[PDB]
């Protein structure tokens, strides 16, 4: 690596080159760390994690027992080994704790002061990071598998909420109105996601093997309805254009926002184009999943070749997004993995499982 240092020093290669090459090297050498720990606080499994977007310091986690821990990943100690102490926690003793499993906790974008969560108690609560008090609560008529806030929108603050009804809900964290709904799906909505690039493009995955991108400004259906064979087996859109063969329960736009990775219960990933819904035929091999709710997964940022970290049974699988190769298989858990989140700042990966653990993977050397 001294070659990269000298090249950066004499201005040959842009500093971008060393930065990205070193980030890729670190992610390729990713391994579990016994030189770091995250305190065990959840009675049941961990369903979700979301490192804060700005400064990458705090870290929420939605336990399956309704407790929302709020970790602190900065090594405030002096020793090489440390444990990420849990700063706060919405314990069961809290008056407004979630009665059932918390399956999505997300920071309010552009404002770390607040964060949101939602649970099978058919509620979505807007939590205040400082005083830990519900700022706003929206009660739905049915459960809430997954919700997501636009990480790019400075204009609106709508919140797609995929209930187990066929209708996507849009909740407004400004003056409350959950009236706006997006009709067109046929079964439960297991995973939604806003477009990181465009303000108003929402991609919603369902359990009927359909992935649709909605222009929420448009109030006459969806822009696109993803189709496996790119229209080869052309059929009108009444029972066709199925992005999978079984339930599709996970979405993750690539970091640039140009491609919409989807993973479904048919045990395949597919890197769909995000502008016209044309499958790009990246193989990815066979990816194992059998979960019956929102499967979380994330994609690396600031690396030469974009990696994707998909929960694969009880192991994290690391694929290269644009080539489909399998980099490795991080292997440290005791039950199925429910959510892995990438710490972009230092190329660290935190993967909550169903065994109440949150294993923090870090690079070697």
């Amino acid at each position: 690596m001294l070659g990269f240092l000298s090249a950066r020093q004499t201005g040959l290669e842009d500093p971008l080159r060393l930065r990205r090459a070193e980030s890729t090297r670190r992610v390729l050498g990713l391994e579990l760390n016994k030189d770091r720990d995250v305190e065990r606080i959840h009675g049941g499994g961990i369903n979700t994690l979301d490192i804060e977007p700005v400064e990458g310091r705090y870290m929420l986690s939605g336990g399956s027992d309704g407790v929302i821990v709020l970790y602190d990943l900065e090594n405030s100690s002096r020793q090489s080994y440390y444990t990420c102490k849990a700063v706060c926690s919405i314990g069961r003793d809290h008056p407004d704790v979630h009665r059932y499993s918390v399956e999505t906790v997300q920071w309010y974008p552009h404002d770390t002061g607040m964060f949101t969560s939602s649970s099978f108690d058919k509620t979505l609560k807007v939590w205040d990071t400082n005083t830990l008090q519900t700022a706003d609560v929206f009660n739905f008529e049915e459960t809430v598998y997954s919700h997501h806030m636009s990480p790019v929108s400075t204009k609106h603050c709508l919140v797609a909420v995929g209930t187990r009804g066929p209708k996507v809900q849009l909740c407004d964290l400004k003056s409350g109105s959950c009236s706006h709904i997006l009709q067109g799906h046929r079964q439960e909505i297991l995973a939604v996601s806003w477009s990181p690039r465009y303000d108003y493009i929402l991609a919603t995955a369902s359990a009927d093997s359909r992935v649709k991108l909605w222009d929420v400004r448009r109030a006459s259906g969806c822009l696109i309805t993803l189709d496996q064979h790119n229209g080869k087996k052309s059929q009108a859109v009444e029972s066709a254009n199925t992005a999978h063969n079984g339930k599709v329960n996970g979405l993750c736009f690539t970091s640039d926002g140009l491609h919409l990775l989807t993973v479904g219960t048919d045990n395949r990933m597919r890197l769909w184009n995000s502008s016209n819904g044309e499958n790009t035929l990246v193989n990815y091999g066979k990816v194992c999943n059998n979960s019956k709710k929102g499967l979380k997964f994330t994609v690396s940022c600031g690396c030469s070749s974009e990696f994707v970290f998909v929960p694969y049974g009880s192991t994290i699988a690391v694929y290269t997004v644009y080539s489909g190769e399998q980099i490795t298989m991080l292997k440290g858990h005791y039950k199925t993995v429910d959510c892995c989140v990438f710490q972009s700042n230092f190329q660290e990966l935190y993967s909550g499982s169903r065994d109440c653990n949150i294993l923090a993977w870090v690079p070697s050397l």
Partner: protein, 148 residues
């Protein structure tokens, strides 16, 4: 010096005795203290025995493993290297891989491995955080009754 070791381990495990016959176990202790690669050779012997289909043989292999664990430190590192498979073969956690017969020996294996894992968590848990992970996983995810 592998022939006598494979032999002695075979008479220890295949006998099916309720309790470890003492003097040949002491011979195993001495000759396992002799060399480190041969201690790990005994570890492979134990692992190969533990996969084989008989609850009494698995019990003998596990009790030897517990002896070496409480007696050796490099053995603790080596076994925590694959504690996941060790738990799959001892505790029968995976329904797709239960324990062989007989039922009495399997029950004794379950009780003995639960109590040995308790002792290991108390004695070597801090030095081996992966043992702590395994103990926690057994105590909540698998809900193993440690009070039984």
């Amino acid at each position: 010096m592998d022939q006598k070791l494979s032999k002695l381990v075979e008479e220890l495990t295949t006998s099916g005795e309720p309790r470890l016959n003492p003097e040949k176990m002491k011979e195993l202790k001495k000759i396992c203290k002799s060399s480190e690669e041969q201690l790990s050779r005994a570890y492979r012997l134990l692992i190969a025995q533990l996969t084989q289909e008989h609850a009494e043989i698995r019990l003998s292999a596990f009790q030897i493993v517990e002896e070496l664990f409480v007696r050796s430190h490099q053995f603790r590192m080596l076994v925590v290297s694959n504690f996941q498979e060790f738990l799959e073969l001892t505790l029968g956690t995976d329904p797709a891989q239960p324990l062989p017969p007989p039922r009495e020996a399997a029950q004794r294996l379950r009780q003995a491995t639960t109590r040995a894992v308790e002792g290991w968590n108390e004695k070597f848990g801090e030095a081996y955080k992966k043992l702590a992970l395994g103990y926690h996983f057994l105590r909540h995810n698998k809900k193993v009754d440690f009070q039984d």
